[PDB]
Each structure stands twice: as structure tokens, then as C-alpha cells.
Amino acid sequence: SDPLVVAANIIGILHLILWILDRLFFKSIYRFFEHGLK
Amino acid sequence: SDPLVVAANIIGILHLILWILDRLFFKSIYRFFEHGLK
Amino acid sequence: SDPLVVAANIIGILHLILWILDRLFFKSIYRFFEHGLK
Amino acid sequence: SDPLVVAANIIGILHLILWILDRLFFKSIYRFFEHGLK
Numbered sequence: 001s002d003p004l005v006v007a008a009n010i011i012g013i014l015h016l017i018l019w020i021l022d023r024l025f026f027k028s029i030y031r032f033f034e035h036g037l038k
Numbered sequence: 039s040d041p042l043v044v045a046a047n048i049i050g051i052l053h054l055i056l057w058i059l060d061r062l063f064f065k066s067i068y069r070f071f072e073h074g075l076k
Numbered sequence: 077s078d079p080l081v082v083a084a085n086i087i088g089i090l091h092l093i094l095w096i097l098d099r100l101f102f103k104s105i106y107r108f109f110e111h112g113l114k
Numbered sequence: 115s116d117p118l119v120v121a122a123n124i125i126g127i128l129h130l131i132l133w134i135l136d137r138l139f140f141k142s143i144y145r146f147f148e149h150g151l152k
Binding site: 039040043044046047050051053054057066067068 | 080081083084087088090091094108109112113114
């Protein structure tokens, strides 16, 4: 195989897994307004 | 062709397609506020 | 010359170009709210 | 020794360092609304 190209391929699926992983968050519009305007 | 590079290339145009398509996700700012505040 | 791997390199400087191209300006709070509440 | 893949390899970890580096940048709902609505 080739750990050099494979390594990079993982760096890509990394930025992706990071985006969708953080998206599954339900977040909250009330927590942002009451926590932002204190 | 070489599925390793060809694949990674696609994984790139993917993270991109996901960035812009996710940006258009937002649309009705009035509904979102009527879904969280209520 | 290898347009396949080279093409990818450009796809990278692309995702970067975009991110910063929008940072310069693309929010507009008075426009998204006056046109968001419809 | 392959300067073509190695080169992009650095451009990739760059988009990453620049992505997370820009993320640590916090903000404020009262600052963007008092500076944007003005």
C-alpha cells in the first residue's frame, strides 16, 4: 500500500467526520438568546 | 482509473458540496424562531 | 505533467479561497433579518 | 521523495490548521447586533 496517500485520504475524511459529527448537535435557539444576551 | 486518488478527489468535491449545500439549508428565519421559541 | 493530482491541489486552494472570500463580508444582519422575516 | 504529493500534503494540513484556528475565534450576540444594527 502507500501510507503517504492513504494518510492524506484520512485527513479528508477527518475534516468531514468533524463537520457532520458536530452537526448531529440539536443546539438550541433559546439557550443562545438567554445565554448570549445574559 | 486509480480508485485511490480518484476516490480522494471525490472526497474533496464532497466536503465542498456539503459546505455550500449546508449553507443554503437556512431559509425562513421566522420559522426557525417559531420552532425554537415555541 | 499529471493533471489528476494537480487538479486536486487546486481543489484544496479552492476550499481555502472560498472560506476567506466570504469572511471579507457575507453576513449583513439588517439584510438577513429584514428579508428573513419576510 | 515525492514533492508533488508531499507539497499538497502540507496545503491540506494548512486548510486544517486554518480551519480550527479560525474556529477558536468566539463572538457575541449583543456585539454583532449592536455593531451590525448600527
